[PDB]
Design a protein around this ligand. Sequence first.
Ligand SMILES: [Zn+2]
Ligand SMILES: [Zn+2]
Lengths: 417, 414, 347
Amino acid sequence: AHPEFMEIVKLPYANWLAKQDRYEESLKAYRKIGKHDMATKMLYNLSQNAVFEKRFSDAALFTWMIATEHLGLIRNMKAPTPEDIENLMKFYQYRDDAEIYFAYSKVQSFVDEPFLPLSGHAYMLNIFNAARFAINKLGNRQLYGVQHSYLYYSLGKVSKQLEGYKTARICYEKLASYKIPTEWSEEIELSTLLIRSKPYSDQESLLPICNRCYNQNPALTEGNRCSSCMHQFQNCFISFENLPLVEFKLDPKITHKRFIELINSDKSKTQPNKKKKKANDGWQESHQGDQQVLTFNNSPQKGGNDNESSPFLDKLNEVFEIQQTTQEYIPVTLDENIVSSLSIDEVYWVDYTKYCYTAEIKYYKSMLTDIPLKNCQECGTFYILDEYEFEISKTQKCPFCRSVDERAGPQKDVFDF
Amino acid sequence: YKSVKQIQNPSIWEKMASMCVKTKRIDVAEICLGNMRFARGSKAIREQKKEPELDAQLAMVAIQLNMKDEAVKLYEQSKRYDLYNKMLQAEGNWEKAIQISENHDRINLKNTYYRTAQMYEVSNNYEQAILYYEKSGTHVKEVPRMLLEAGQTEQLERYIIDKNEKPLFKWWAQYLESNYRIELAVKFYRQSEDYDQMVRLFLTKNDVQTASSICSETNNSAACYILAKYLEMNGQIPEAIQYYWKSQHYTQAVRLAREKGMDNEVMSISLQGPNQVKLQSAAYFEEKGFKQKAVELYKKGGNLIKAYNLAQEEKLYDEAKQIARQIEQEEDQRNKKRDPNDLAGIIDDFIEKGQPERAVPLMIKAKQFERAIETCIRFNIPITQDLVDKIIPTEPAKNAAEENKRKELMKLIA
Amino acid sequence: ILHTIQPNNNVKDQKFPQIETDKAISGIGLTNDFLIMLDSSGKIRYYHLEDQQFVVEYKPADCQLVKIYPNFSGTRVVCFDNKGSAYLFEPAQEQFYPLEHFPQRAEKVLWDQKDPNLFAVLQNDTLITFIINKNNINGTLIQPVKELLAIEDIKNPGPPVQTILDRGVKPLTLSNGLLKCFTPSGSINGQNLTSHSYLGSYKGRDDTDQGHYRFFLQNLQLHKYNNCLIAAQFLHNAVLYKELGRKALEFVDLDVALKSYQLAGSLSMVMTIQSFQHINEKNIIYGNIAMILGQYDLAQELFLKSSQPILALEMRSDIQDYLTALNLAKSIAPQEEPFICRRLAFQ
Ligand SMILES: [Zn+2]
Ligand SMILES: [Zn+2]
């Protein structure tokens, strides 16, 4: 009845919410109000509690909240001030912490529950992928919460169940350099002795292949990066499976949004015209000429697949040669022609306009158009649909963003707030 | 310092630290502890240096030099109880810590319960351990873990019978199948309604009939998914495609049907599928001999700009007018809003609608202090000190005009 | 020669072992999946049954080998060499460990199925018990367990515990602290070693003082730290609490140490114990334990051996030694030169 007084009921309500166990509602109320110093302090305390109580999912959610708060602080100005850069790197580091916490939560849920002697192939494949990804992402930071031994032991067991002889040997040597409780020692030396006689050179068909390179890579390659070049991998968070994605940048002169209309008009005009079209020219060149070469080595494999003759791939190869010449990473910058040859569905740009109106934007392209990818913009997380609909059906809450599903109506009413 | 230098002695050093604690000086206390060469207290100090409250650091020094009641008094004076709660937990009086947390914190009560349960488990009083695990936040995994650590199974049977919980049944059946107790594991899985477990157990012995009956009567997505996974190796492509369609795994079913070359199934399942599978199936039909079905699917598909383009390509007339009307509509919804126009329009329309309370941070970010004050006066927005020193920087003005504007804004706020 | 018991239809004989030497094999050992050969030239060889290949070889093996006894799994092996010498060998590490205080005429060694750490050596009339310790700080410990009746007065080397065996009787094996003693008329006596004998004799229903202390002493000897903590909690003496906490911290038994220190009434150590419990990094924990308990130079050496020398640098800054801290800072991380320098300015 009185739209002019709002806070006077919210602050006692915020205190009452703090009285009960609904601490996240208190956090969101404090964020709406603006006073976030004590809110951030008590959120850090809750994150410490969740880490101690082995609730690594809640810890990851709290670290994500902390990162969002730091990005909201990044909102301050846009001039090149050192506070912006330090807060941006802090946000990236906190996102890495949240992801490593989620991966450790998964591997700990695996290890704590007694393992099935005959477990599902997909389950153990997912466990192996999660352990390998977590080991690659963390490496040596020995951050707060991870003991670094459970991951190696689980990876060794799942590799012994899934060949993976080189990875098994590497993780077994690491665990030998590591300290283990006496329960798992004689087992680890027995497993090492048994695996010493097994054939080497892994088993193929399991190692990830880096995009924009078509080159094989070992499972453990430092901080989650292919050895062939400098390119970040992308993995679905539900399945921890490598994604066929590449990163590209846009020009700072052309505006992306009139650009969308112009590129769509380019696709529309390039089909009935008698001057042919570059997009179909690329497909026809791929269909006509095909080069596919495979070379075998001990750890690596070089896949010479350059059949698809498209301007994007030609420029990508030229940029890769430039990278080899310079031995340093320069992200690709694209002009209007190449995207004019592109389409609408394949782009999977990640936007952070909700938290900060003008901070950055990242653009990604999928090499394989057959596989569908869904990008949750609330958390900016990539998933394969095929398990995404199943996950949404099982629970109406997205795992990482911890928000309501899009299919259901708005649940955040006054009662929820 | 110059008087202390000439003598030096560890007892003298600890006495010096005591005087420093009682006189409320920290840096000289740190110097005295450094002269002590007590690594443990120095490590505690360096860990505790990350606190805005110096009272907590002084209490840390006092408990380092074994002054307990002074530390308690300092904790009470600083309005800090969580550190005092940790100290009271560490010394040993658990019930007092429980009462203090209940009447003051209500945040670490679950942690206190878990720590007391762990201490009881160390004391080997398993009944108290399970009781406090029930009082704790989590009890589904702590009880079975500690109960196998003891190795006494039978009371765990009692507990799972009393609780009658699905996760407990699942875990116990997993333990049973670990020790090759197949039948009781099947019974507990049935009590837990994990149909994937029954399906995998039946396919372990290749008993496809019972698994088929169970998946037919339950009609579960994951059970049908794994049954179709088996059928893939069983040479049962049509039933596998049907089960994959029933399990809502559209991509695998549609790609398999396209690979083996079936016609009615692919669009029949794409009509009920998402947009991406519709586009892929329509492109596959364009690859197929009869492009008319591809044109129809594109017409019913989620992409209509390409549908208009191919309508012009096929130069039909009726569907050309239908897609022309649809493209007129699509141009209208696209003209409804742009992305940068979204930013500008949200800002302006947000101002227009009202809600000045969340508009104030935008004006703070845009430095429009005069507009912010005008809005605050307009809607009676309370002006607190945080707003006052956000609008007016605490730094001195570098320019005379800056100071004049600061004074004008300050008197307007007054 | 090798043979297969179950099949007789196969007409292919097993691949004959040995090399051009073709002499009698000094030591033969069967495990579940491995075969251990020791030749008179002083060389040890490992053979995989399925692959029929020499996976592990060791030629030098001191001067000369005489007798061998492998573990039931094969990860451990003990070797008896000339002049009555003894060694412990690990295929995983491929390095020998000399053994001390062993009799020169003991003919057999019996492993323990319950605990691989414990094993026994049978002299013609006496039985000795040995243990392998890997959780010890900066040391892989092998020591004949002693017997002691003093009230924590002395911790020094002494006579080893000896179990008296009857004449003309051979125990079959040792397991669960029980030895399968064989005596005429087909009699099997479980008996017990006179180390675990007092452990099994203790009841603790009404509890005692001298017997309780002896039980605590033998538990400390055998590292049964749960019995140690219960024996501590019966007797509220603070000095015993401190000694047990120090001993538990020495053998990286963190939970027992924290419980003992909490029962003692000390907190400044328990916060550090929890902080150490968080970390799993291995050289980090070992150096932290060395710093928290005793000397500081060895903790510094462990920290340099780790991947975080900055921890050693800050520890030396804590020690406030100009020469060591400044030289180490210049050696490893010269980007922290200013701050420490300021400290010495105060000095
Ligand atoms: Zn690459
Ligand atoms: Zn999401």
